[PDB]
Amino acid sequence: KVFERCELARTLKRLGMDGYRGISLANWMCLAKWESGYNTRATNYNAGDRSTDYGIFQINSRYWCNDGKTGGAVNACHLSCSALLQDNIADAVACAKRVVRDPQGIRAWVAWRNRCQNRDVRQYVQGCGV
């Protein structure tokens, strides 16, 4: 599914993402926006290392989910990568929370660093009632 901006912001608030491990809601919004355009079915194959990024947060199969074809991969979120392509984002959110529990936090995503870090991200949540 392709979420609308404020619909996603309200969903993420309810799922407890606001301030999770010190990360504001607008930072999560900025991340979803640049990783998938708020698209839960997005997938990106990395020909260079044979991994795939899945879902709204573009979570990688080398460490976080199992797709069986990745190669020396772990499944830190204990999920099939298929779970990250559902319209319901509860599993994707649970996994994104696991990702930021590692030392890098939100910096795990290079898109976050280039496109969101040290920027005015208020635009992503403006007028959503969150």
Curated annotation (Swiss-Prot):
Residues 1-130 form the C-type lysozyme domain. Its EC number is 3.2.1.17. SMART domains: LYZ1. It is found in: Secreted. GO terms for cellular component: azurophil granule lumen; extracellular exosome; extracellular region; extracellular space; specific granule lumen; tertiary granule lumen. Keywords: Amyloid, Amyloidosis, Antimicrobial, Bacteriolytic enzyme, Disease variant, Disulfide bond, Glycosidase, Hydrolase, Secreted, Signal. Disulfide bonds join C6-C128, C30-C116, C65-C81, C77-C95. One of its GO terms (molecular function) is identical protein binding. The keyword Transmembrane helix does not apply. Pfam families: Lys. It catalyses: Hydrolysis of (1->4)-beta-linkages between N-acetylmuramic acid and N-acetyl-D-glucosamine residues in a peptidoglycan and between N-acetyl-D-glucosamine residues in chitodextrins. One of its GO terms (biological process) is antimicrobial humoral response. InterPro entries: Glyco_hydro_22, Glyco_hydro_22_CS, Glyco_hydro_22_lys, Lysozyme-like_dom_sf. Its main location: secreted. The active site is at E35, D53. Lysozymes have primarily a bacteriolytic function; those in tissues and body fluids are associated with the monocyte-macrophage system and enhance the activity of immunoagents. It is linked to Amyloidosis, hereditary systemic 5: A form of hereditary systemic amyloidosis, a disorder characterized by amyloid deposition in multiple tissues resulting in a wide clinical spectrum. AMYLD5 primarily affects the viscera, and the predominant clinical features are renal dysfunction of varying severity, and intra-abdominal bleeding. Inheritance is autosomal dominant. Lysozyme C is capable of both hydrolysis and transglycosylation; it also shows a slight esterase activity. It acts rapidly on both peptide-substituted and unsubstituted peptidoglycan, and slowly on chitin oligosaccharides. Belongs to the glycosyl hydrolase 22 family. Monomer. This is Lysozyme C. It comes from Homo sapiens.
